[PDB]
Amino acid sequence: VEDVCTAKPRDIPVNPMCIYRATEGQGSEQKIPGATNRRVWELSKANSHFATAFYQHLADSKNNNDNIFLSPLSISTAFAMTKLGACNNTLTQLMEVFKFDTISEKTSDQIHFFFAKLNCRLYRKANKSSELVSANRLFGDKSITFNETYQDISEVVYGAKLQPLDFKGNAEQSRLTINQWISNKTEGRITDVIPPQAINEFTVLVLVNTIYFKGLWKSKFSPENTRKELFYKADGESCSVLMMYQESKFRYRRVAESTQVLELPFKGDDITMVLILPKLEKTLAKVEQELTPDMLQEWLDELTETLLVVHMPRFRIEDSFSVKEQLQDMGLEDLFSPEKSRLPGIVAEGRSDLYVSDAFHKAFLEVNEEGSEAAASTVISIAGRSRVTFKANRPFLVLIREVALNTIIFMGRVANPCVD
Numbered sequence: 001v002e003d004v005c006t007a008k009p010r011d012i013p014v015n016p017m018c019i020y021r022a023t024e025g026q027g028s029e030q031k032i033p034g035a036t037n038r039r040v041w042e043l044s045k046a047n048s049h050f051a052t053a054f055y056q057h058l059a060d061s062k063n064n065n066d067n068i069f070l071s072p073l074s075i076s077t078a079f080a081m082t083k084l085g086a087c088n089n090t091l092t093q094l095m096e097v098f099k100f101d102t103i104s105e106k107t108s109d110q111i112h113f114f115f116a117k118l119n120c121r122l123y124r125k126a127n128k129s130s131e132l133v134s135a136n137r138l139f140g141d142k143s144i145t146f147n148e149t150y151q152d153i154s155e156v157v158y159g160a161k162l163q164p165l166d167f168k169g170n171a172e173q174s175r176l177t178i179n180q181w182i183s184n185k186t187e188g189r190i191t192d193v194i195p196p197q198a199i200n201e202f203t204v205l206v207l208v209n210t211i212y213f214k215g216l217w218k219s220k221f222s223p224e225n226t227r228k229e230l231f232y233k234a235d236g237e238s239c240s241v242l243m244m245y246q247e248s249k250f251r252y253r254r255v256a257e258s259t260q261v262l263e264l265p266f267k268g269d270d271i272t273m274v275l276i277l278p279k280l281e282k283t284l285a286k287v288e289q290e291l292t293p294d295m296l297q298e299w300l301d302e303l304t305e306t307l308l309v310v311h312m313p314r315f316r317i318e319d320s321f322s323v324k325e326q327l328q329d330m331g332l333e334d335l336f337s338p339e340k341s342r343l344p345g346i347v348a349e350g351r352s353d354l355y356v357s358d359a360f361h362k363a364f365l366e367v368n369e370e371g372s373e374a375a376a377s378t379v380i381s382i383a384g385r386s387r388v389t390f391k392a393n394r395p396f397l398v399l400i401r402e403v404a405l406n407t408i409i410f411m412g413r414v415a416n417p418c419v420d
Contacts, residue, residue: 004156005120012113014153017345018087020095020108027294028102039103039114040121044407046099047076048293051408053099057326059288059413065234067317067419069363069398069412071211071376075323078209078378080115081136081158082335082356083108085150085345090334097332116157121405128268130215132402132409135185136160139178140205141167144385145349160207167203175199178206182377185210189364189375193320198381204354205346208379213400213409215266216371219248221314223369231313231417234284234395239418241313243393244369248310252390253302259287261298262308262390266371271409273372274299274399275312277392284395284413293408299401311391314369315417320362323378327359338384350386357383365398365412374400374410 004012030041051072062068076098083094091108095101100111123134138154140146142164154160163181165174178199179192190210199206221244229243251263258279265272276298278287324336334340341355359380366373395415402409 002124003116003120003159005116012116012156013149014109014112014157016084016109016149016153018091020091020101021106023104024102028104037114037117039105039110040118040405042103043111043114043118044405045293046102047073048406048408049099049102050076050097051411052291052293053330054326055411056288056291057329058321061326064285065415067319067413067415069317069319069365069410069414070321070361071363071374071410073407073409074209074211074376074378075361077115077119077134077136077158078207078380080111081138081154081160081207081209082380082382084112084153085147085343085354086335087344088342089340090342093332093334097327097330112153112157118405118407119158122402122407126268126270129270130213130266132213132271133211135210136208137163137181138205138207139163139165139174141165141203141385143168144204144347146205147345147348147351150345167199167206168201171200171203178208178379182208182210182379186212186364186375186377187373189373190362190377193360193362193377194379194381195360198358198360202383202385203357204382204385206379206381208377211376211409213271213374214371215271218265218267218269219246219250220371221246221369226314226369229311229393232394234415239416241315241393241417244312244314246310247387248308249305250308250310251302251304252306252308252388253298253304255298255301257282257286260390261302262310263299263302270404271400271402273367274401275392275396276399277390277394277396284397284415288397288413306388309387309389311393312367313393313414313417314367315414316366316420317412317414317417318362318364320360323359323361323380324356343382346382347386353384353386354382355384356380363410363412365410365414376410
């Protein structure tokens with residue numbers, strides 16, 4: 001069994017309460033993937049536009065000397081899970097902000113199928129490759145009878161089991177139970193996401209998503225060619241880092257405005273790490289400000305195995321934030337206003353007032369001699385009740401693609417590596 005996605009020949013129970021809907025029309029392409037639904041391609045593309053669109057926004061909100069790291073795929077999954085229960089305008093905005101309107105189908109109900117199609121085609125049993133894994137769960141207050149078909153399109157399409165907690169009474173204790181589920185599901189890395197008073201008396205459903213990844217480098221680094229070196233911080237100050245070094249053949253190009261893009265694949269070429277180390281004289285800010293997921297030229301043009309002598313800090317960056325600030329700026333407004341939020345698919349017995357009170361995300365990355373472990377979580381809580389050389393020793397951005405499907409699984413700016 002490997003879920004609904006590729007059952008046998010098949011069909012799924014997907015039909016929520018409301019449906020939205022003319023697509024983007026120009027571009028929003030497909031890799032000449034003549035196959036029935038090769039929508040999953042345009043889903044990954046839509047998803048990756050939101051990833052760039054969400055980073056450009058978060059990076060602007062974040063002081064340039066801070067590290068950023070998120071898993072745009074975690075963020076698109078946890079909200080497409082919530083768009084099941086949405087309706088009317090809340091739905092027009094979830095389709096619009098997360099770019100789901102770009103997938104060429106005429107109806108929002110379809111996107112859910114295509115997400116289970118790309119998820120099955122992503123966390124698959126790769127007994128060589130790596131460890132890319134996800135776990136979605138819907139925890140709701142024991143006292144609310146939840147909507148039965150919600151409950152189930154979630155079992156099928158997202159693998160999200162309902163778990164009753166006693167939010168209403170024992171909410172502080174309930175926060176500890178979800179926070180620990182996330183710990184377990186990310187191999188103890190994304191610890192305590194949900195901040196101290198985020199869940200209380202009136203939380204109806206907390207829904208959580210996770211994504212964990214471990215991968216060994218193809219071309220490992222030697223613990224002996226690991227000297228300390230200065231990393232010249234984003235602010236022009238510097239710190240001592242344990243800087244890894246190796247000589248190898250790797251995909252590479254020096255792209256627009258001498259912004260070097262390296263791809264270092266993990267064990268058995270499915271997942272890679274992309275590093276964008278922009279020239280000395282530039283500022284990573286510029287390259288952050290003009291990022292466009294249709295700058296995939298950058299990525300796909302370095303199919304030129306090139307002999308690098310690579311220097312790279314081994315670091316550990318950990319980060320968390322509120323997706324509610326930046327999504328509001330992105331345009332998702334109705335979903336968070338108790339006034340304007342329309343979500344009738346989630347509750348049966350009340351069915352009405354529910355809104356997203358806050359929405360969190362925490363992330364992790366340890367890159368090191370033998371490989372890297374990344375982890376990520378999102379919980380959206382809802383309430384209402386009813387010898388060329390590439391010496392990366394200065395800030396750079398990090399992508400972690402899953403090549404086959406092209407899905408930016410994680411994205412970051414390691415701007416200060418001498419943190420733990």
